[PDB]
Amino acid sequence: HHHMNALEHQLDYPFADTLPAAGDTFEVAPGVRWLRMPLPFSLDHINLWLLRDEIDGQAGWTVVDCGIASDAIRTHWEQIFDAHLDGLPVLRVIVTHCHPDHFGLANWLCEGGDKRRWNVRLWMTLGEYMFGCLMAAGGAAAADHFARHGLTDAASLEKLRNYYSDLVPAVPPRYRRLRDGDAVTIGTRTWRVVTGYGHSPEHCALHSEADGVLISGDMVLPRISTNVSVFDLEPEANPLALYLQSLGRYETMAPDTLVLPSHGKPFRGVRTRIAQLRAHHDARLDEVRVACAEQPMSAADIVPIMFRRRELDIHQMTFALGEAIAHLNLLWLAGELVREQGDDGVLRFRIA
Amino acid sequence: HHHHMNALEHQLDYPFADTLPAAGDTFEVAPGVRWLRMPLPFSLDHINLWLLRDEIDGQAGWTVVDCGIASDAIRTHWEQIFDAHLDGLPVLRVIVTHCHPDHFGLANWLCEGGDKRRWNVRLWMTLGEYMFGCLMAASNAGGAAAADHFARHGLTDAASLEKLRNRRSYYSDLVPAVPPRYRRLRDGDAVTIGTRTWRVVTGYGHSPEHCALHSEADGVLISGDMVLPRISTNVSVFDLEPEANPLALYLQSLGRYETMAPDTLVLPSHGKPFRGVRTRIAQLRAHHDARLDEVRVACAEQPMSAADIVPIMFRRRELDIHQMTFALGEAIAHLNLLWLAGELVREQGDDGVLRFRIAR
Ligand SMILES: [Ca+2]
Ligand SMILES: [Cl-]
Ligand SMILES: [Zn+2]
Ligand SMILES: [Zn+2]
Ligand SMILES: [Zn+2]
Numbered sequence: 001h002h003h004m005n006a007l008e009h010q011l012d013y014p015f016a017d018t019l020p021a022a023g024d025t026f027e028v029a030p031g032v033r034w035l036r037m038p039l040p041f042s043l044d045h046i047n048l049w050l051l052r053d054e055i056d057g058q059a060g061w062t063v064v065d066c067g068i069a070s071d072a073i074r075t076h077w078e079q080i081f082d083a084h085l086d087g088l089p090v091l092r093v094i095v096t097h098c099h100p101d102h103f104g105l106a107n108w109l110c111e112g113g114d115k116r117r118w119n120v121r122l123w124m125t126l127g128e129y130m131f132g133c134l135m136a137a138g139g140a141a142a143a144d145h146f147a148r149h150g151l152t153d154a155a156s157l158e159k160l161r162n163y164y165s166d167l168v169p170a171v172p173p174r175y176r177r178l179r180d181g182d183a184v185t186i187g188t189r190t191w192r193v194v195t196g197y198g199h200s201p202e203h204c205a206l207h208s209e210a211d212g213v214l215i216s217g218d219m220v221l222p223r224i225s226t227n228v229s230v231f232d233l234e235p236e237a238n239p240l241a242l243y244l245q246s247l248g249r250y251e252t253m254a255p256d257t258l259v260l261p262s263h264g265k266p267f268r269g270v271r272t273r274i275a276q277l278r279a280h281h282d283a284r285l286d287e288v289r290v291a292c293a294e295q296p297m298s299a300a301d302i303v304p305i306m307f308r309r310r311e312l313d314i315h316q317m318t319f320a321l322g323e324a325i326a327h328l329n330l331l332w333l334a335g336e337l338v339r340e341q342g343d344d345g346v347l348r349f350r351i352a
Numbered sequence: 353h354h355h356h357m358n359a360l361e362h363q364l365d366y367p368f369a370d371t372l373p374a375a376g377d378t379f380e381v382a383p384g385v386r387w388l389r390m391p392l393p394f395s396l397d398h399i400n401l402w403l404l405r406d407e408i409d410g411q412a413g414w415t416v417v418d419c420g421i422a423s424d425a426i427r428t429h430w431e432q433i434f435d436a437h438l439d440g441l442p443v444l445r446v447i448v449t450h451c452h453p454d455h456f457g458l459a460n461w462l463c464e465g466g467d468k469r470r471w472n473v474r475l476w477m478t479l480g481e482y483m484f485g486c487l488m489a490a491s492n493a494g495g496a497a498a499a500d501h502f503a504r505h506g507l508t509d510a511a512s513l514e515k516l517r518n519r520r521s522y523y524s525d526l527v528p529a530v531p532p533r534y535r536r537l538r539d540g541d542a543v544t545i546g547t548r549t550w551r552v553v554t555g556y557g558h559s560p561e562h563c564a565l566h567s568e569a570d571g572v573l574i575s576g577d578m579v580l581p582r583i584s585t586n587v588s589v590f591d592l593e594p595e596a597n598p599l600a601l602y603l604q605s606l607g608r609y610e611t612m613a614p615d616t617l618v619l620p621s622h623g624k625p626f627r628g629v630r631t632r633i634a635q636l637r638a639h640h641d642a643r644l645d646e647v648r649v650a651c652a653e654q655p656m657s658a659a660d661i662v663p664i665m666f667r668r669r670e671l672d673i674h675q676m677t678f679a680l681g682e683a684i685a686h687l688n689l690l691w692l693a694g695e696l697v698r699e700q701g702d703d704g705v706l707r708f709r710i711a712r
């Protein structure tokens with residue numbers, strides 16, 4: 001499903017192949033601890049952050065992201081509670097975006113974990129909190145969306161008509177809203193909210209400019225590309241253009257910025273990684289331009305060029321198809337393509 | 353009621369004096385821009401909606417700005433607009449400035465073509481307004497969460513708290529349906545409508561991500577609820593975001609209009625088209641500074657809950673449960689602004705009520 005970074009050697013990993021063991025922490029900067037939780041997908045882990053802090057005279061910790069709601073991840077959090085918090089409480093929970101591996105356990109943490117050790121506030125952007133609430137409170141519409149984009153396998157379309165709430169079983173009933181540019185004081189640092197678009201409604205990245213640390217969430221990952229998909233809720237969305245524009249926010253940061261990604265390892269070379277991501281989507285866009293210059297193309301037609309050797313499952317094709325529509329929509333909305341609905345009800349794109 | 357009337361209204365210019373379109377009729381306020389006025393059954397008895405002459409993909413028609421609540425009266429007048437005042441051309445799309453029921457309630461009914469299913473068109477909206485409306489349509493001024501929120505801000509009247517719990521369906525009755533898809537508007541986006549390029553100008557504090565539309569070349573501003581000539585814009589703190597700072601957000605958002613050309617024709621959602629956008633911003637700022645000062649003074653005397661500020665902020669007024677809801681939320685907005693800035697200290701008393709006193 002993901003696109004792997006073959007130019008990883010152009011990045012430098014300041015801790016080489018060190019990984020915190022499940023249930024342990026590793027200090028990546030003074031008062032900034034790295035946690036790694038297991039996930040049962042092809043992406044087998046998420047990195048979470050523990051930040052030493054003091055709010056209103058109470059010493060403690062600010063958590064960044066939560067994990068999915070699994071028994072494994074709950075157990076590792078309790079180990080961390082017992083052993084690696086210096087006996088201090090969590091003071092608040094910051095969540096970068098609504099996706100289940102970042103948000104699933106936000107309510108459990110806010111309610112103090114299995115032993116209800118504290119009661120603290122969720123911090124989140126409005127778009128991520130609203131969308132997660134909506135998704136945690138939720139079909140045929142998705143099947144028709146993909147049908148117009150070339151998914152004609154009758155078995156596949158029927159399966160789609162017939163997951164989030166299991167991983168995000170509960171949502172905090174209140175939140176404190178973060179917005180772009182907000183200053184969040186955490187321990188000795190001023191972290192600045194840096195909003196990102198295209199991947200999710202209103203992704204919150206945190207930048208500590210004085211010492212050059214970036215909690216990049218899923219917007220800048222060293223080993224994989226960031227998913228951008230067009231879904232049925234917003235069928236004319238331009239997430240790829242939104243994503244490429246949001247990347248400009250990191251291109252200007254200091255070259256030695258320590259990037260703390262949600263997947264992969266802490267790395268330096270944020271400007272180098274942005275250049276790789278731009279090249280990748282420009283190469284992927286060019287493949288679409290070429291294909292649409294021969295004959296009109298649907299998203300299902302685009303998938304085998306964009307994603308060579310998928311052998312993909314039904315769930316996998318959902319994100320592959322959504323990414324093709326993202327690339328087709330960028331060129332369509334930019335005037336490089338013309339979109340037409342064929343007699344079979346499928347949407348196709350051709351060069352202008 | 354709960355709105356603050358503009359005593360300096362004479363400093364604004366109304367290019368159409370006291371002209372008002374009749375219900376079911378339109379009045380042209382600028383080339384290709386028609387004004388509709390719908391009735392509402394509140395103390396605010398109307399909302400202005402906008403019809404913009406347009407052409408998308410070669411099909412001539414109309415882009416609608418805002419919808420009305422879903423009342424029988426408002427549906428009837430819309431059907432009259434379709435039959436008589438559209439030149440027999442279809443609606444092409446519906447733009448909604450924010451999620452509030454009088455702007456959003458009939459968006460789905462409009463998009464699906466009204467009672468006669470005359471067309472099928474796309475909703476245009478900011479992500480924050482669309483998500484929040486969907487959530488509330490599935491609220492701010494009703495439900496057990498709202499009653500507990502206002503109870504800790506000083507509302508003790510047993511009947512009012514009972515009335516608040518039963519308004520669990522206050523929002524869903526006015527917005528009975530919501531469109532299942534949307535086209536996202538963002539700050540700075542250019543929307544080509546007819547002969548104009550309108551720019552999205554986002555505003556905060558009143559609602560999640562309020563969309564105003566600015567046509568810079570000819571000086572037209574569809575201000576939604578952010579700039580109203582006769583009343584202030586409501587800023588409320590609700591249960592979902594209890595430490596919110598909507599007044600700071602609102603006062604900051606007003607800068608986007610403060611710099612606009614002085615000759616700007618403002619098309620507000622309540623009141624009449626006017627000129628004097630800069631003057632009205634100056635009025636609103638002076639107004640919010642005077643209310644903030646009243647709160648500072650009161651909180652220097654004794655600890656004050658929001659319920660204690662309401663009789664000060666809204667002098668000698670008889671408020672029903674709907675009115676008291678927004679009055680209470682605005683008092684919390686003013687208290688929160690001062691608290692978060694460090695001028696006040698917030699403490700919860702043994703009765704569970706939050707009270708504010710000046711920082712010493
Ligand atoms: Ca938003
Ligand atoms: Cl757009
Ligand atoms: Zn993600
Ligand atoms: Zn992720
Ligand atoms: Zn409103």
Ligand SMILES: [Zn+2]
Binds near residue numbers: 399452454455577
């Ligand atoms: Zn309104």
